[PDB]
Design a protein around this nucleic acid. Structure first.
Ligand SMILES: Cc1cn([C@H]2C[C@H](O)[C@@H](COP(=O)(O)NP(=O)(O)OP(=O)(O)O)O2)c(=O)[nH]c1=O
Ligand SMILES: [Mg+2]
Length: 426
DNA sequence: ATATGACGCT
DNA sequence: AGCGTCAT
């Protein structure tokens, strides 16, 4: 394998929600502006920021009323609200558009709402003998950088770009249809044309990674951004990882990586390499001394599971602070309220994808519990009717109340998560 | 007081 | 089945 079988990409839309609202209300174009959920408490919570607005310091998970103190001429599109919660239809609609476009090129896996990994390996082959040995001109990759290039014997940003591109193509071996670096270059032209096509047909710009496995392609994606792609070649990796902080590797963002530093005593992805696959396992998993040991050597094998369609549909809403729920009548209302948008989507799912969910998950968080899901009770799901799901998901949870008046509810709930899983082909 | 989906482990 | 972890 040597971390060079597949050709894998990760496309990712640049401030996805913001572009969607930027394409709708065009005054928002080329202006610093963010998108917000809810309006009462301090102007709303941010979730997405145009890059002209990150220039002032505006981050997500920040109060719109605070980021207005960071940015003065910062515009504000609010996410459509329905039944007192977030109605993200707009963006899922935009999402299905871009994935229809991408799917035309290679088998893709829907990563997030705005991300898709692509398995270009099967495609790069069906082109290398379908062009004889074409020189592969620079004009075909007008948005690609080559991480780790150019080497060296008054440049601006695009000056430096051309340079590394021509260094790539110069040592290119358009003859060796086997060389791994050459196929990288092929998948990249494809991603150039994929990326060029999405803009052509949605107006949405995005950024890509092109490399040999899921992980490199993601880290590659975020390097040059926005409206750019990076081709982290197998040879880039020792330079790229030498100073890459370990937490920037997908899967290493959470606890595992946190302890990886605290146990091994390091900070960068390169520092992780001075250990045996045996040695690492004793400090971590039997699967994690392994996975790490290949990763820090630029090798990963988790395949692009081709799947453009989520396995689960779910509606969630938080009740933070003094807005937690403490009434039998209050919990019941929202569970219906949640069940009402859930029906809507499930029917949208039925007549779109020809499938139907079978089990319902009801989940709640509690004021106090150091947990997202303090409870998660998985039940049955026949007909797509809210009142049925409403009452049934309630009767699931009614027996963890500890108020001795049954009109009230305690400890109050911070979250209701209604989630439909197990879609059968009917 | 920063709405969602994927998966792993038991 | 039901928790815990990771992610956008
Ligand atoms: C991380 C995150 C994202 N989102 C929404 C908003 C994003 O616009 C959209 C994709 O999130 P992203 O890919 O992490 N960031 P972005 O697409 O807005 O900006 P960029 O990719 O860094 O250019 O999903 C949430 O609603 N809650 C969250 O916690
Ligand atoms: Mg994005």
């Amino acid at each position: 394998a040597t971390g060079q079988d597949r050709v894998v990409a990760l496309v990712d839309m640049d401030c996805f929600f913001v572009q969607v609202e930027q394409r709708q209300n065009p005054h928002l174009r080329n202006k610093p502006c963010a998108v917000v959920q809810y309006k009462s408490w301090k102007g709303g919570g941010i979730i997405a920021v145009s890059y002209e607005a990150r220039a002032f310091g505006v981050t997500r998970s920040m109060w719109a009323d605070d980021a207005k103190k960071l940015c003065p001429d910062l515009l504000l599109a609010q996410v459509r609200e329905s039944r007192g919660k977030a109605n993200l239809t707009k963006y899922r609609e935009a999402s299905v558009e871009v994935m229809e476009i991408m799917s035309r090129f290679a088998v893709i896996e829907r990563a997030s709402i705005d991300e898709a990994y692509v398995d270009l390996t099967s495609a790069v082959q069906e082109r290398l003998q379908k062009l004889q040995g074409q020189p592969i001109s620079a004009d075909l990759l007008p948005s690609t950088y080559i991480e780790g290039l150019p080497q060296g014997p008054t440049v601006q940003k695009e000056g430096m770009r051309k340079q590394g591109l021509f260094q790539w193509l110069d040592s290119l071996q358009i003859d060796n249809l086997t060389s791994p670096d050459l196929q990288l270059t092929v998948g990249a032209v494809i991603v150039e044309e994929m990326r060029a096509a999405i803009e052509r047909e949605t107006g949405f710009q995005c950024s890509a990674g092109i490399s040999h496995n899921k992980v490199l392609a993601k880290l590659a994606c975020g390097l040059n951004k926005p409206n750019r792609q990076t081709l982290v070649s197998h040879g880039s990796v020792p330079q790229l990882f030498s100073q890459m902080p370990i937490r920037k590797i997908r899967s290493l963002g959470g606890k595992l990586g946190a302890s990886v530093i605290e146990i091994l005593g390091i900070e960068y992805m390169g520092e992780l390499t001075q250990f045996t696959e045996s040695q690492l396992q004793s400090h971590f998993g039997e699967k994690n001394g392994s996975w790490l040991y290949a990763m820090c050597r630029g090798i990963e094998h988790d395949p692009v599971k081709p799947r453009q369609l989520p396995k689960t549909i779910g509606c969630s809403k938080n009740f933070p602070g003094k807005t937690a729920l403490a009434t039998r009548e209050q919990v019941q209302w929202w569970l219906l309220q949640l069940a009402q948008e859930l029906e809507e989507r499930l029917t949208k799912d039925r007549n779109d994808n020809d499938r139907v969910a079978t089990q319902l998950v009801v989940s709640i968080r509690v004021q106090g519990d150091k947990r997202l899901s303090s409870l998660r009770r998985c039940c049955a799901l026949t007909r797509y009717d809210a009142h049925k799901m409403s009452h049934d998901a309630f009767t699931v949870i009614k027996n963890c109340n500890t108020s001795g008046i049954q009109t009230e509810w305690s400890p109050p709930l911070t979250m209701l998560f209604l989630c439909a899983t197990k879609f059968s082909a009917s």
